[PDB]
Structures are given as structure tokens and as C-alpha cells.
């Protein structure tokens, strides 16, 4: 085994031959004094018997080394669970500050990930935080991987990525649940708007606002008066959370030729079809948020596990400005590394 | 077809023969003037051609009847989606106020349900509300069924039910993530406490508090001083939400001989085993709340769909009093009616 000296929180390997051998497996960072191993690297090498560590003239066991590193940094075992698993799974993880992540990890000649480690309970973040994590790896060969560690050190990995999208009126009687179209609705129905029951077409609230804005229906009050788009938004938002932000995402998707319906049954605000709902499964499950919306590890686990169970992609739609509008889409994919 | 007269929001069927025939299929309520049909019943019968409805001398079409009923009560189409589906699925739903539910529904001689209808966005409720819904059917032959209607009138059904549960120290070095036991931990490990890595046992925060309270470990600070149960609760709760309530549920389950671990990966606070985790799958996914905790339709869908995907039962643990403690358990089961 290579011999290392613990100095502060780094383990130095002075022997040139051993340092070269370890570095050829992507352990450590060269330094003026010799190869410097990060705590995760030193502990891993010590546990598998490839490194002996001394502090002064005292041999530090793998158990004592874990103890030391946890005392120095309470987050160490969380990071280390990911480090050791990545090494086990064939990756070469390099601790560092690049990309704002805990590790950059390499596999083969083509696989490159920046690994953001989150603890089940201790790490809070917003949608804006996710945008900022992504921005750091944008235009690079590194994928953003979020590694979530639960309280008992079991792991889940996610790839977060940018999604770029492709792509004489009927009377609509407005009510709390959208609007009712009783006559001349067949065209709208064939274009996948609304839900037909018997010989009446029900439009949901977003469909009602959208088709009004696009000049496809004339919405009316019970007394037969028109309602404006703004009057509809005001009416519907009273008891429906995030309605205006949800609407601009509904409108963006629908403008582009997607078909948008309730995503309730799949755990989202929307389920989204590419073309023909009668023929195809919906492709995306979409949640709408704003930059300051607080998110959780629980959101990431639940959203992706649900989406996976029905073979759909989960998408976070971040409405950055409601009135312009400005919207960005982030896919979350549960991934085996 | 039977002839009915719309009076207010009820349809009266005066013809004794037709009234008797309809009532034999559990439509309507007898009245001094004849059989009185609820809006849901009248519309359903009218849509399937078994009833003709007049208002005064004017024939009201099924489409016009829907229009009238929605204008009178914006929640009608939400209720009606459930009513019509229950009739389709072989149930005989009776509108009324009994049990505080929208319907009592009957099938065969043995199936009896009280159906609580929730709209995807418009209906908010608490854990206390669920306890109150359950209390109304407690000790009766009726099961509590929650029917959730999404914005586009697709449906999901849930059975909510009561769950009644069955059933010289090692040094533990406390840190942010629980505690570390380096020596004499094999007994605790074999009893399924903690997570072994190499030759060290990691105890998570609830395990650390529990095993301290039960006199199974001596927790210590980095300077070697003891910590009390209350000091541990105070330490861990600073950055962990609902910690004290979560702890009393952890303790209740573990006292009874269940094995409790993080439920993160299955969308809960806990995953719970009956006996032997190395042998068995966990049986329950548990979320801990308090009576005033706000819940949503989204919680019900997501929790049960996730639990179903891994063939586990989702359980809501309501901590009604932290200090006594007083805890009740409610199972949520996604069900095909």
C-alpha cells in the first residue's frame, strides 16, 4: 500500500512511484510537495487497502479516519456516500470547486458529469438555484447530475437538462370550472380542445382563457355579456393557485402545437402531447413554478419516480416573467449511473 | 320514457308505474307528490333516454338540462362526473347529506360507500378534515371513498381507512446527521438499527434519539459529554422540519417492533417493515402530519400512485398530541370501483 501523511484535511503521498500510480487512476491533485488526496479519496483508498495513513507517527485506521473527517465536516459522510458509489460504479470523481459542484466525474473518453450533492432534509433550494446550477455547465461537455442522499445513505441520481420546445365564433358560457359550448363546437373538439360530454363541449379554465385570447370563442356571462381575457384571468385565479403563470405556459405550449391537458393524474399541472392525444400517450408531465418558488429533494424524487412509472418525461417550467412572457424549461430525469 | 316535471332543481315523476320502476333501480326519493329526482339522477336518466323533462310546457333537452344545472350550481358537473361514472360502473348512488358526503352508493348486497367528491384545484382540506370524514362512517358498513375529479373530468377513487398498529452501552458520537458508533455495535446492527459502512455503524437522527431514550446507546458531544433526549431533539430539529412529531411516530412504530427507515425513495418520511428488512420489502410508506396540516388532492394522487408503483400501502400518521403522545393512522388506497 502507498504511504500517506495526513496534514490538515489532505493526505500527502510523497513517494513518486506511488503518487504516479494513484494519479493514473485519477486520485489526487499534484502539488509542490507531492500528490495531495482529498478526504473522500484518502478514505476510499484506505478502506480498500491501497493507502496507509499516518498523522505524525500515529497510524490512522479507516474507522478513525472516517471519525476525523466527520468531526471536521458534518457533511462529509453525505458527500462520501456519493463519492464511494461513483467509484464503485466505474466513475472517476474529482473533488473541487469547478461548476459549483462537489465533484466532476469522468468515465471512458466521453462521459463527463458535474455532481451536485443534496441531503434529504438539510438542503433547500429554489427554481432559480436550478437555473444557476445549469448555467454553470451550459455549453460544456459536462452534464448536471444531482445526487440525493437519504438519511440512511441510500442514493438517487438525476440528470437536469435544458428543454427547448419545438413548433361567428362559438358561444362559451363561463362558469367556475371553465365554460360550456353547446353549439358549433365540433371544430374545436376535433382540434382536441375541451372535453365532450353527450352533446356539449366543456372547456377547462386555461382552454377558456386561451381560446378567448386567440379569437376562437366568445365567452359570456350568464346575462350574455362578453368577458375579456383579463376578466377571465381575474375570475379564475381567485381560487386557483399560480393561475397566471400556469396560463402563460399553457399558452406557450398550445401556440406551438402541443396539446395540453390536466397533468393531475401523473402528478403535474399539465400532461403534454406532441400531436394526437387519441393516438399517442402524452410525452411530458409539467409543473409550473417561478424563480423564487421553493423546491425540495422530495419534489425531485416524487416527480421523476411518478413520471418514470408511466414512461413520461418530467419538466419544470419556470415562468421568469409573466407579462412578457419569459419561460424556460428544465427536464428532470431519474438516471442509473 | 318516463315523464318528469322540473320544479326548482328537482324532477318530479307523477306516474305511479314509472315512479315505481325508476325507484326499483334506486333512482329518486319518494315524496307526497311523487318520485323526486335529484339533478344528477334526472340528467343521467334524460341522457340515456329513460326520462323526458318539461319545465312548464317546455321540453328541456339533455343539453339544456346540463346548462340549467351548471348555472344553478357551478359544482354540479364535478359531482355529475362521479355520479355518471358510478352508475356506469354498476353502483347505485344516492345523493343526500348522510355522512357529509355527496353520495351514498350501493352495489350488490354487501358494497356500501360514502363518496366524498373533491375537485382538483378548488377543494382544500386538512388532516383534521380527513379524521372528521372518517369519524362519520366509523362503526358503519360504509367505507369512505374519496373521488377526485380533475379539471377535464377524469376520475380517481381512494378508500380512506383506519389503520391500527400491531405489536456499558455503546458510545454514539453525535453529529448533524445522527451519530457514529465505532465499537460494540453488532447487536444494534443485527436488530436492524443503523447503516453499517465498513466497520462503523451510522445511526440516523431518529435512531439516535430513540436509542438514547430507550437506554441502548450513550450519545456524546465531541468533548465526550452526554446529551439528553431533549438536547438531541433540540439539536436535530433546527434544520429538520416536523422533527418532534416525526420522532413520536418513529418511536411508536419501533416500540411495537416495526423496523423504520427513511421513506424518501418511496415518497414518504418513513418506510416501515414488519420484521426483517433483509428478507422482506417494507410494507408501509408513512407521512407524518398534524391535524392542522394543509393537504391537497395532489398529495392523495401522488402518495398513492407512488406507493402503488412499488406495491406498498401509503399511511398518513396524524400526530394529534406530541407530548402524550396521541397518534392516529389513516391508510389511503387507490382503488378501482
XYZ file of C-alpha atoms in Angstrom:
674
model
C 0.000 0.000 0.000
C 1.022 3.597 -0.674
C 2.014 5.623 2.382
C 0.250 8.893 3.059
C 0.604 11.608 5.663
C -2.476 13.399 6.950
C -1.768 17.129 7.044
C -4.805 19.193 7.923
C -7.555 17.584 5.863
C -5.373 16.389 2.977
C -3.290 13.231 2.698
C 0.095 13.713 1.045
C 1.766 10.874 -0.841
C 5.458 11.754 -1.192
C 6.664 8.597 -2.919
C 6.894 9.455 -6.619
C 6.122 5.934 -7.833
C 3.055 5.515 -5.633
C 1.882 9.062 -6.347
C 2.148 8.444 -10.082
C 0.228 5.176 -9.791
C -2.566 6.764 -7.782
C -2.775 9.769 -10.112
C -3.039 7.470 -13.137
C -6.341 6.317 -11.607
C -7.334 9.986 -11.238
C -6.782 10.143 -7.477
C -5.497 13.384 -6.042
C -4.028 16.656 -7.204
C -0.322 17.136 -7.863
C 1.346 19.634 -5.571
C 4.795 21.035 -4.959
C 5.215 18.595 -2.052
C 3.651 15.590 -3.789
C 0.239 14.088 -4.525
C -2.495 15.616 -2.367
C -5.523 13.438 -1.682
C -8.907 14.874 -0.723
C -10.594 13.351 2.336
C -13.018 11.323 0.182
C -10.130 9.934 -1.852
C -7.922 9.150 1.132
C -10.727 7.385 2.975
C -11.727 5.356 -0.082
C -8.135 4.279 -0.754
C -7.637 3.463 2.945
C -10.840 1.383 3.118
C -9.828 -0.723 0.114
C -6.304 -1.237 1.475
C -4.427 0.826 -1.123
C -3.301 3.512 1.306
C -1.891 3.657 4.811
C -2.372 6.961 6.594
C -0.310 8.405 9.415
C -0.762 11.570 11.451
C 2.635 12.336 12.892
C 3.890 8.849 13.793
C 0.410 7.520 14.549
C -1.331 5.112 12.171
C -4.908 6.202 11.499
C -7.317 3.331 10.804
C -10.093 3.656 8.190
C -12.566 3.889 11.073
C -10.578 6.625 12.804
C -10.186 8.452 9.504
C -13.961 8.474 8.973
C -14.368 9.766 12.531
C -11.863 12.585 11.931
C -13.410 13.659 8.659
C -16.977 13.682 10.038
C -15.897 15.729 13.060
C -14.209 18.259 10.786
C -17.127 18.455 8.354
C -20.584 17.090 9.240
C -21.468 16.907 5.539
C -18.528 14.617 4.768
C -20.445 11.321 5.080
C -23.108 12.661 2.708
C -20.505 13.569 0.075
C -18.594 10.365 0.745
C -21.616 8.160 0.098
C -21.797 9.633 -3.390
C -18.026 9.521 -3.912
C -17.725 5.853 -2.970
C -20.737 4.882 -5.045
C -19.427 6.729 -8.102
C -16.069 4.949 -7.760
C -17.891 1.630 -7.382
C -19.988 2.367 -10.499
C -16.912 2.981 -12.676
C -16.606 6.778 -12.445
C -13.523 8.782 -11.512
C -14.799 11.618 -9.302
C -12.609 14.657 -8.731
C -13.458 16.881 -5.774
C -13.166 20.594 -6.469
C -14.995 23.880 -6.909
C -15.423 23.874 -10.703
C -19.101 24.273 -11.739
C -20.049 24.848 -8.082
C -20.486 21.105 -7.667
C -18.939 18.678 -5.175
C -17.339 16.590 -7.930
C -16.509 16.471 -11.597
C -16.689 12.816 -12.590
C -15.264 11.107 -15.650
C -15.912 7.763 -17.294
C -14.454 6.470 -20.532
C -13.499 9.159 -23.011
C -16.967 10.685 -23.411
C -18.812 10.717 -20.077
C -18.466 13.893 -18.025
C -20.713 14.960 -15.162
C -20.796 17.758 -12.609
C -22.265 16.277 -9.434
C -24.399 18.411 -7.116
C -24.914 16.569 -3.812
C -28.136 17.117 -1.847
C -29.040 15.752 1.581
C -32.620 14.511 2.036
C -33.581 17.099 4.659
C -30.771 19.614 5.019
C -30.604 21.132 1.537
C -33.229 23.647 0.456
C -33.220 25.246 -2.994
C -35.345 27.255 -5.420
C -36.150 27.041 -9.107
C -33.703 29.941 -9.565
C -30.999 27.812 -7.929
C -31.594 25.097 -10.515
C -31.261 27.624 -13.343
C -27.988 28.766 -11.822
C -26.655 25.217 -11.435
C -27.464 24.606 -15.106
C -25.954 27.857 -16.326
C -22.562 26.812 -14.935
C -22.372 23.725 -17.177
C -24.102 25.307 -20.181
C -22.101 24.967 -23.393
C -19.717 22.476 -21.790
C -19.408 18.722 -22.227
C -20.477 18.226 -18.607
C -23.995 17.155 -17.719
C -25.525 18.398 -14.494
C -26.158 15.445 -12.186
C -27.992 15.878 -8.916
C -27.201 13.185 -6.368
C -29.638 12.935 -3.478
C -28.556 11.097 -0.338
C -31.235 9.980 2.096
C -30.846 9.910 5.884
C -29.620 6.302 5.715
C -27.125 6.960 2.842
C -29.094 5.356 0.018
C -28.740 7.262 -3.260
C -30.618 8.539 -6.284
C -29.208 10.323 -9.320
C -30.865 12.804 -11.698
C -29.809 14.488 -14.894
C -31.113 18.055 -15.116
C -31.134 19.459 -18.637
C -32.433 22.291 -20.777
C -35.560 21.527 -22.785
C -36.194 23.639 -25.877
C -39.706 23.361 -27.301
C -40.478 22.751 -30.958
C -43.332 24.056 -33.084
C -69.307 33.902 -35.880
C -67.405 32.279 -33.011
C -68.976 29.635 -30.791
C -70.579 30.926 -27.595
C -68.822 29.812 -24.416
C -70.868 30.127 -21.218
C -68.329 30.838 -18.483
C -68.592 29.243 -15.055
C -66.313 28.377 -12.138
C -64.960 25.312 -13.950
C -64.264 26.880 -17.345
C -67.011 27.239 -19.953
C -69.715 25.302 -21.792
C -70.091 25.290 -25.573
C -73.417 23.829 -26.742
C -73.378 24.678 -30.442
C -70.874 24.602 -33.324
C -68.090 23.093 -31.223
C -67.112 20.208 -33.496
C -64.129 22.056 -34.979
C -62.680 22.879 -31.561
C -63.332 19.311 -30.418
C -61.502 17.816 -33.409
C -58.561 20.114 -32.624
C -58.519 18.434 -29.177
C -59.857 21.359 -27.162
C -62.298 20.611 -24.408
C -63.983 17.518 -23.082
C -67.178 16.391 -24.791
C -69.968 15.029 -22.650
C -73.009 13.954 -24.612
C -73.618 16.844 -26.990
C -71.873 19.590 -25.010
C -68.199 20.633 -25.019
C -66.690 21.564 -21.655
C -63.642 23.845 -21.819
C -61.410 23.932 -18.749
C -60.238 27.310 -17.340
C -56.986 27.584 -19.322
C -58.748 26.443 -22.508
C -61.379 29.120 -21.924
C -58.813 31.889 -21.476
C -56.667 30.689 -24.391
C -59.451 30.277 -26.931
C -60.769 33.709 -25.949
C -57.348 35.322 -26.431
C -56.863 33.571 -29.777
C -60.280 34.620 -31.079
C -61.690 31.094 -31.210
C -64.648 31.525 -28.802
C -66.865 34.316 -27.495
C -67.038 33.854 -23.703
C -70.153 35.194 -21.986
C -71.560 35.783 -18.512
C -74.949 34.295 -17.544
C -76.564 37.556 -18.694
C -74.919 37.237 -22.102
C -72.180 39.850 -21.643
C -68.652 39.380 -23.002
C -65.681 38.713 -20.743
C -62.185 39.909 -21.585
C -59.047 37.830 -21.205
C -58.123 39.879 -18.133
C -61.608 39.417 -16.662
C -61.252 35.661 -17.171
C -57.808 35.579 -15.547
C -59.162 37.556 -12.606
C -62.222 35.310 -12.335
C -60.343 32.012 -12.450
C -57.355 32.987 -10.280
C -59.444 33.695 -7.178
C -59.401 30.064 -6.039
C -56.744 28.586 -8.322
C -53.087 28.965 -7.280
C -50.432 30.183 -9.713
C -53.075 30.685 -12.385
C -51.477 33.497 -14.400
C -48.099 31.728 -14.522
C -49.802 28.458 -15.380
C -51.694 30.198 -18.182
C -48.629 31.576 -19.963
C -47.135 28.070 -20.001
C -50.426 26.606 -21.272
C -50.442 29.267 -23.999
C -46.780 28.809 -24.939
C -47.183 25.053 -25.393
C -50.520 25.294 -27.200
C -49.279 28.078 -29.548
C -46.538 25.713 -30.626
C -48.994 22.971 -31.493
C -48.755 20.802 -28.387
C -51.997 19.547 -26.867
C -52.202 20.381 -23.166
C -54.499 18.708 -20.619
C -54.559 18.322 -16.837
C -51.469 16.584 -15.535
C -53.170 15.806 -12.239
C -53.265 12.044 -12.716
C -49.494 11.945 -13.383
C -48.508 14.379 -10.638
C -48.143 17.577 -12.636
C -50.051 20.675 -13.624
C -50.100 19.570 -17.277
C -49.749 16.477 -19.385
C -48.492 17.440 -22.831
C -48.960 15.690 -26.188
C -46.902 16.200 -29.324
C -49.781 15.926 -31.791
C -52.689 13.499 -31.474
C -53.966 12.586 -27.965
C -56.398 9.983 -29.336
C -53.432 8.166 -30.844
C -50.448 8.944 -28.632
C -49.513 8.956 -24.965
C -48.690 12.355 -23.520
C -44.933 12.910 -23.640
C -44.351 15.368 -20.774
C -45.593 15.930 -17.259
C -45.153 19.634 -16.497
C -45.059 21.611 -13.250
C -45.127 25.411 -13.437
C -43.152 27.489 -10.946
C -41.479 30.878 -10.621
C -37.794 31.566 -9.880
C -38.346 32.159 -6.144
C -40.512 29.045 -5.731
C -39.052 26.829 -3.008
C -38.376 23.276 -4.160
C -37.261 20.174 -2.302
C -35.421 16.911 -2.662
C -38.865 15.339 -2.191
C -40.173 17.146 -5.289
C -37.343 15.744 -7.390
C -37.773 12.166 -6.190
C -41.562 12.115 -6.422
C -41.930 13.943 -9.732
C -39.436 11.767 -11.571
C -40.425 8.473 -9.988
C -44.062 9.126 -10.939
C -43.141 10.196 -14.468
C -40.925 7.157 -14.881
C -43.709 4.830 -13.739
C -45.778 5.941 -16.738
C -42.790 6.355 -19.105
C -43.083 10.128 -19.434
C -40.533 12.938 -19.015
C -40.922 15.339 -16.098
C -40.448 19.015 -16.961
C -40.162 22.046 -14.691
C -41.469 25.160 -16.447
C -40.021 28.269 -14.837
C -42.000 31.415 -15.565
C -39.358 34.108 -15.221
C -41.631 36.925 -16.327
C -45.390 36.507 -16.575
C -46.156 39.553 -18.687
C -43.548 39.369 -21.457
C -43.615 36.288 -21.075
C -40.250 34.702 -20.377
C -40.261 30.956 -19.739
C -37.570 28.297 -19.523
C -37.996 24.543 -19.348
C -35.846 22.104 -17.363
C -36.147 18.340 -17.681
C -35.507 16.141 -14.637
C -34.550 12.567 -15.441
C -34.032 9.808 -12.871
C -30.878 8.049 -14.067
C -28.816 4.947 -13.349
C -25.161 5.979 -13.288
C -89.702 7.164 -21.429
C -90.990 8.333 -18.051
C -92.293 11.898 -17.933
C -90.845 14.291 -15.396
C -91.550 17.874 -14.425
C -88.696 20.148 -13.404
C -89.719 22.067 -10.291
C -86.911 24.126 -8.830
C -83.941 21.774 -9.018
C -85.874 18.510 -8.664
C -87.669 16.489 -11.325
C -90.999 15.032 -10.225
C -92.334 11.832 -11.767
C -96.065 11.668 -11.009
C -96.918 8.480 -12.884
C -97.042 5.729 -10.259
C -95.920 2.961 -12.615
C -92.937 4.890 -13.957
C -92.034 6.183 -10.496
C -92.069 2.647 -9.119
C -89.897 1.393 -11.976
C -87.345 4.158 -11.514
C -87.278 3.709 -7.734
C -86.678 -0.030 -8.136
C -83.367 0.971 -9.752
C -82.705 3.239 -6.751
C -83.447 6.494 -8.576
C -85.067 9.265 -6.598
C -86.750 9.812 -3.269
C -90.447 9.180 -2.695
C -92.427 12.275 -1.814
C -96.007 13.222 -1.092
C -96.358 14.436 -4.696
C -94.466 11.548 -6.303
C -90.908 10.441 -7.048
C -88.419 13.297 -6.717
C -85.254 13.030 -8.791
C -82.052 14.867 -7.892
C -80.392 16.853 -10.688
C -77.706 14.180 -11.202
C -80.366 11.488 -11.485
C -82.640 13.459 -13.795
C -79.788 14.374 -16.120
C -78.476 10.807 -16.239
C -81.929 9.381 -16.988
C -82.532 12.092 -19.611
C -79.178 11.451 -21.329
C -79.864 7.720 -21.638
C -83.393 8.328 -22.945
C -85.311 6.995 -19.933
C -86.774 10.348 -18.935
C -88.357 13.306 -20.679
C -88.241 16.556 -18.741
C -90.550 19.534 -19.052
C -90.463 22.928 -17.366
C -93.977 24.267 -17.612
C -94.976 23.157 -21.122
C -91.437 23.421 -22.482
C -89.388 20.305 -23.240
C -85.888 20.584 -21.791
C -83.215 18.731 -23.778
C -80.354 16.889 -22.024
C -78.050 19.686 -23.187
C -80.342 22.394 -21.828
C -80.728 20.465 -18.586
C -76.947 20.339 -18.114
C -76.821 24.078 -18.817
C -79.522 24.789 -16.212
C -77.917 22.663 -13.538
C -74.434 24.156 -14.057
C -75.825 27.696 -13.907
C -77.610 26.895 -10.652
C -74.606 25.156 -9.095
C -71.092 25.511 -10.555
C -70.021 22.322 -8.768
C -72.717 20.249 -10.474
C -70.547 18.998 -13.366
C -67.896 17.873 -10.872
C -70.437 15.861 -8.866
C -72.102 14.643 -12.046
C -68.878 13.221 -13.458
C -68.655 10.999 -10.395
C -72.374 10.177 -10.404
C -72.410 9.091 -14.044
C -69.232 7.073 -13.666
C -70.545 5.284 -10.575
C -73.754 4.389 -12.436
C -71.680 3.175 -15.386
C -69.505 1.057 -13.053
C -72.515 -0.754 -11.555
C -73.149 1.352 -8.436
C -76.431 2.911 -7.346
C -75.505 6.356 -5.992
C -77.968 8.208 -3.787
C -77.450 11.944 -3.360
C -78.020 13.215 0.164
C -76.455 14.665 3.291
C -75.847 11.448 5.256
C -72.171 11.074 6.306
C -71.450 14.578 4.965
C -70.721 13.064 1.566
C -72.176 13.833 -1.867
C -73.460 10.276 -2.317
C -74.102 7.005 -0.573
C -73.567 4.308 -3.186
C -74.696 0.698 -3.146
C -73.692 -2.359 -5.134
C -74.879 -5.914 -4.648
C -75.937 -6.748 -1.116
C -72.595 -6.022 0.562
C -70.920 -2.995 -1.035
C -71.631 0.351 0.614
C -69.620 3.535 0.164
C -69.895 7.153 1.253
C -68.460 9.242 -1.577
C -66.626 12.494 -0.838
C -66.116 14.430 -4.089
C -63.049 16.663 -4.475
C -62.198 18.980 -7.363
C -58.553 19.040 -8.489
C -57.938 22.685 -7.573
C -60.964 24.037 -5.738
C -61.091 21.813 -2.656
C -58.639 22.388 0.178
C -58.617 20.247 3.320
C -56.556 19.370 6.389
C -55.561 16.171 8.138
C -58.218 17.049 10.741
C -60.809 17.139 7.947
C -59.864 13.591 6.979
C -60.273 12.428 10.581
C -63.700 14.037 10.621
C -64.746 12.449 7.319
C -63.715 9.061 8.720
C -65.433 9.545 12.060
C -68.787 9.919 10.288
C -68.610 6.411 8.787
C -66.877 4.788 11.768
C -68.687 1.696 13.031
C -70.927 1.601 9.961
C -70.898 -0.711 6.954
C -69.965 2.227 4.720
C -66.416 2.738 3.515
C -65.152 6.262 2.996
C -64.383 6.789 -0.690
C -62.750 9.964 -1.911
C -63.433 10.710 -5.565
C -61.125 13.263 -7.147
C -62.196 14.926 -10.387
C -59.552 16.668 -12.466
C -60.115 19.844 -14.491
C -61.023 17.759 -17.554
C -63.425 15.423 -15.633
C -61.195 12.353 -15.461
C -61.552 10.486 -12.162
C -59.646 8.704 -9.425
C -61.054 6.893 -6.404
C -59.500 6.259 -2.978
C -60.539 4.289 0.056
C -59.532 6.025 3.288
C -59.460 3.725 6.300
C -58.303 3.444 9.888
C -55.031 1.598 10.415
C -54.430 0.077 13.843
C -50.844 -0.989 14.504
C -49.849 -4.367 15.897
C -47.016 -5.283 18.243
C -21.858 -0.481 29.354
C -23.752 0.990 26.399
C -22.072 1.678 23.069
C -20.737 5.208 22.609
C -22.544 7.215 19.937
C -20.687 10.288 18.662
C -23.404 12.779 17.744
C -23.172 14.925 14.630
C -25.507 16.791 12.280
C -26.509 13.565 10.521
C -27.172 11.396 13.575
C -24.344 9.576 15.353
C -21.401 7.242 14.769
C -20.845 4.030 16.719
C -17.356 2.564 16.227
C -17.290 -0.177 18.853
C -19.638 -2.895 20.149
C -22.382 -2.098 17.644
C -23.005 -5.596 16.294
C -26.058 -6.176 18.497
C -27.733 -2.951 17.377
C -26.839 -3.733 13.765
C -28.391 -7.210 13.933
C -31.550 -5.616 15.358
C -31.615 -3.522 12.146
C -30.624 -0.194 13.680
C -28.264 1.990 11.740
C -26.390 1.693 8.490
C -23.033 -0.077 8.556
C -20.245 1.298 6.421
C -17.033 -0.674 6.654
C -16.557 -1.188 10.381
C -18.619 1.759 11.632
C -22.363 1.974 12.355
C -24.104 5.202 11.352
C -27.322 5.967 13.245
C -29.697 8.453 11.635
C -31.215 11.281 13.748
C -34.380 9.449 14.847
C -32.378 6.288 15.590
C -30.013 8.372 17.710
C -32.821 9.950 19.728
C -34.717 6.661 20.095
C -31.790 4.510 21.181
C -30.814 7.209 23.679
C -34.331 7.330 25.144
C -34.507 3.532 25.341
C -31.132 3.238 27.071
C -29.426 1.449 24.186
C -26.633 3.980 23.459
C -24.724 6.707 25.284
C -24.693 9.735 22.948
C -21.788 12.149 23.362
C -20.603 15.544 22.149
C -17.151 15.899 20.539
C -15.763 16.710 24.000
C -17.211 13.490 25.400
C -20.178 14.984 27.271
C -23.586 13.284 27.398
C -26.594 14.629 25.524
C -30.134 14.223 26.815
C -33.101 13.226 24.689
C -34.339 16.823 24.821
C -30.902 18.141 23.837
C -30.916 15.763 20.863
C -34.414 16.823 19.795
C -33.374 20.462 20.042
C -30.152 19.808 18.124
C -31.739 17.873 15.269
C -34.899 19.976 14.846
C -33.027 23.170 13.960
C -32.819 22.293 10.261
C -35.231 19.361 10.042
C -38.952 20.140 9.656
C -41.581 18.452 11.823
C -38.864 16.642 13.752
C -40.595 16.213 17.119
C -43.804 14.923 15.506
C -41.792 12.667 13.227
C -39.922 11.312 16.247
C -43.003 10.230 18.196
C -44.193 8.287 15.141
C -40.734 6.730 14.697
C -40.811 5.750 18.379
C -44.373 4.403 18.295
C -43.634 2.136 15.330
C -40.247 0.991 16.624
C -41.604 0.293 20.157
C -44.082 -2.065 18.553
C -41.366 -3.997 16.767
C -41.570 -2.460 13.302
C -38.310 -1.525 11.601
C -38.353 2.088 10.423
C -36.047 3.610 7.792
C -36.136 6.659 5.520
C -39.127 6.629 3.215
C -37.526 9.199 0.936
C -37.092 6.884 -2.036
C -40.805 5.944 -1.959
C -42.122 9.452 -1.331
C -42.660 9.339 2.417
C -40.974 10.230 5.670
C -40.657 6.542 6.602
C -40.646 3.132 5.019
C -41.814 0.565 7.555
C -41.040 -3.162 7.803
C -42.982 -5.761 9.753
C -39.975 -7.773 10.923
C -36.893 -8.492 8.820
C -35.712 -5.843 6.296
C -33.007 -8.138 4.887
C -35.734 -10.605 3.963
C -38.876 -8.565 3.351
C -39.983 -5.496 1.433
C -41.156 -2.597 3.563
C -44.936 -2.734 3.921
C -45.859 0.924 4.526
C -44.838 4.325 3.260
C -45.624 6.827 6.021
C -46.039 10.607 6.042
C -46.282 12.387 9.395
C -48.541 15.412 9.801
C -50.506 17.276 12.458
C -54.268 17.951 12.490
C -53.947 21.499 11.104
C -51.549 20.449 8.329
C -52.945 21.531 4.962
C -53.265 18.678 2.478
C -54.203 18.597 -1.188
C -55.742 16.473 -3.885
C -52.204 16.366 -5.309
C -50.906 14.742 -2.108
C -53.505 11.990 -2.364
C -52.833 11.233 -6.025
C -49.047 11.326 -5.768
C -48.676 9.453 -2.484
C -50.887 6.560 -3.522
C -49.702 6.323 -7.110
C -46.092 6.146 -5.888
C -46.930 3.591 -3.203
C -48.860 1.503 -5.699
C -45.948 1.530 -8.147
C -43.839 -0.299 -5.555
C -46.735 -2.367 -4.127
C -46.745 -0.703 -0.712
C -49.539 0.872 1.358
C -49.493 4.626 1.934
C -50.232 5.718 5.505
C -50.881 9.182 6.920
C -49.757 9.374 10.552
C -51.538 12.213 12.319
C -49.797 13.358 15.483
C -52.670 14.801 17.486
C -50.592 15.479 20.576
C -46.803 15.370 20.525
C -46.196 15.177 24.256
C -48.645 12.491 25.397
C -48.337 11.255 22.565
C -51.586 10.762 20.687
C -51.290 9.403 17.151
C -53.756 8.007 14.633
C -53.024 6.282 11.348
C -55.054 6.559 8.137
C -54.422 4.396 5.090
C -55.020 5.830 1.612
C -55.634 3.242 -1.081
C -56.039 3.995 -4.791
C -58.974 1.810 -5.833
C -60.799 0.672 -8.958
C -64.527 0.942 -8.279
